[PDB]
């Protein structure tokens, strides 16, 4: 699908002959993946008071 | 084992259409073909049985294959409607057996006719002497109804096993709708 390789996209290459094998989606940089949803904390507005 | 290639020529002509034979004319001749293609397979695994017709359009309905599943699938709602044309029925039967993988096989054809034929007897004896120079032995078995004491088929088999052929037969049809399993019990027992 050579019409879908827009300038900006992220692709995978070949090592030996160095050709394009597969288009990829974006990357999500695992510092931010381990920043998103690692909190199972379950505090609520009942626990805060005074403000 | 012995080297042949069994080729059945089924009858989808328009006179094989009624219900005088007990299941159907179509099903009773089909299972007769089934038990003899089980007879030719189990005596020799090299023989394959495909079917051809002798109607107006001599179609390769099923190809010559050792499978019978296409044979069983096409012979349901097979539409046996058509004017019989046997004058081309020899040429479709002979030239098929030269398209085979082995010419060292015994050229053997069975032929089922259940309809009145309008051939010339002079044209078939030119085709018979054509088959004399081609060394072909064909045992034609009569089904259905026909001109009784089958016309032009005695003189064809006689001019088929001529010139030291002397091995062919002509199984004629009895004009009574009995069960046709014992009718074909003579070619399965001996030749």
């Amino acid at each position: 699908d050579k019409s879908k390789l827009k300038p900006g996209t992220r692709v995978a290459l070949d090592m030996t002959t160095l050709t394009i094998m597969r288009y990829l989606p974006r990357e999500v940089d695992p510092l931010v993946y381990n920043m998103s949803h690692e909190d199972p904390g379950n505090v609520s507005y009942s626990e805060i008071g005074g403000l | 084992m012995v080297l042949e290639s069994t080729m059945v020529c089924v009858d989808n002509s328009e006179y094989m259409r009624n219900g005088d034979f007990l299941p159907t004319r179509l099903q009773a001749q089909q299972d007769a073909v089934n038990i003899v293609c089980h007879s030719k397979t189990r005596s020799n695994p090299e023989n394959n049985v495909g079917l051809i017709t002798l109607a107006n359009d001599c179609e390769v309905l099923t190809t010559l294959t050792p499978d019978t599943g296409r044979i069983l699938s096409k012979l349901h709602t097979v539409q046996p409607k058509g004017k019989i044309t046997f004058c081309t029925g020899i040429r479709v039967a002979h030239l098929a057996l030269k398209h085979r993988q082995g010419k060292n096989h015994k050229m053997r054809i069975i032929a089922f006719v259940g309809s009145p034929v309008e051939d010339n007897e002079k044209d078939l004896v030119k085709l018979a002497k054509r088959l004399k120079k081609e060394k072909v032995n064909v045992d034609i078995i009569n089904f259905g109804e026909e001109e009784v004491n089958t016309e032009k088929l005695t003189a064809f088999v006689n001019t088929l096993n001529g010139k030291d052929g002397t091995g062919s037969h002509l199984v004629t049809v009895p004009p009574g709708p009995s069960l046709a399993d014992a009718l074909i019990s003579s070619p399965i027992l001996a030749g």
Partner: protein
């Protein structure tokens, strides 16, 4: 319905090699095979083929055979090695359009809807492109039969491809009149193109062989075009078609007069660059 066909030189060679491997029969055999390929953007493409076993007895020449088991599994392999590749129709060797090729096509239209045939050449001699193809059209129409059907020729050429032009131009090594200048057109279409119109003029002479003596069907739908060719024959030289012709000759040759005038001074300057390397070189070197 179909614009044109595109034939690659692979399948062109992939018949003649089969004509050699059956050429030992001597007496008579036509090469009939299965044509593989696609068609995209309304243009018929031809890529691959093979040939199917086939015989023909001369007496009662309506008995043909196509071993469809050989047609099934070998296409089953070719679809397996190449899913992009598929069936496109069929072909036959086509010396002179044999008789079975009215119902070979109707035998195997259950695979390709527009089951096109291809007539090829085995003895190459002409002044054109010896690759013919037809199309199947039927008619409940004018006069002949209640069931009437006649093939119609769709235009045909040899299409190229980037991968095969390496191999095509490698296997020639004989003659290739490239370097398109002022004389490539003179021979590809001015020597040859005038003699192109030779055999098109001579073709309607071959139909004209029936004036009172030839074959029994006469015209009905052949002469409306021929009545128009003599009618649409171009304008005679009386109008300003005289005057506007000399108008552009007095315009096109002006550019030729300027451009040729330029070519002299350029090569005159190149003469001076050669006298700078003759008189200024003999005293130095010797």
């Amino acid at each position: 319905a179909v614009q044109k066909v595109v034939v690659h030189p692979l399948v062109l060679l992939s018949v003649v090699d089969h004509f050699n491997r059956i050429g030992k029969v001597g007496n008579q055999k036509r090469v009939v095979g299965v044509l593989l390929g696609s068609w995209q953007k309304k243009v018929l493409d031809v890529s691959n083929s093979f040939a199917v076993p086939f015989d023909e007895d001369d007496k009662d020449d309506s008995v043909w055979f196509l071993d469809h088991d050989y047609l099934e599994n070998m296409y089953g392999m070719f679809k397996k090695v190449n899913a992009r590749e598929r069936i496109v129709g069929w072909y036959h060797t086509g010396p002179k359009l044999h008789k079975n090729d009215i119902a070979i096509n109707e035998l195997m239209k259950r695979y390709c809807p527009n089951s096109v045939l291809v007539i090829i050449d085995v003895k190459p001699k002409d002044l054109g492109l010896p690759t013919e193809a037809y199309i199947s059209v039927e008619e409940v129409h004018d006069d002949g039969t209640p069931t009437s059907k006649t093939f119609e020729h769709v235009t045909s050429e040899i299409g190229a491809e980037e991968a095969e032009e390496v191999g095509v131009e490698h296997l020639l090594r004989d003659i290739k009149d490239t370097t398109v200048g002022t004389l490539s057109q003179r021979i590809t279409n001015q020597v040859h193109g005038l003699k192109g119109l030779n055999s098109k003029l001579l073709d309607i002479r071959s139909y004209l062989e029936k004036v009172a003596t030839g074959k029994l069907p006469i015209n009905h739908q052949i002469i409306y075009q021929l009545q128009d060719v003599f009618n649409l024959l171009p304008d005679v030289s009386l109008q300003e078609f005289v005057k506007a012709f000399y108008l552009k000759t007095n315009d096109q040759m002006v550019v030729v007069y300027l451009a040729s005038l330029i070519r002299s001074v350029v090569a005159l300057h190149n003469l001076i660059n050669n006298k700078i390397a003759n008189r200024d070189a003999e005293k130095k070197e010797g």
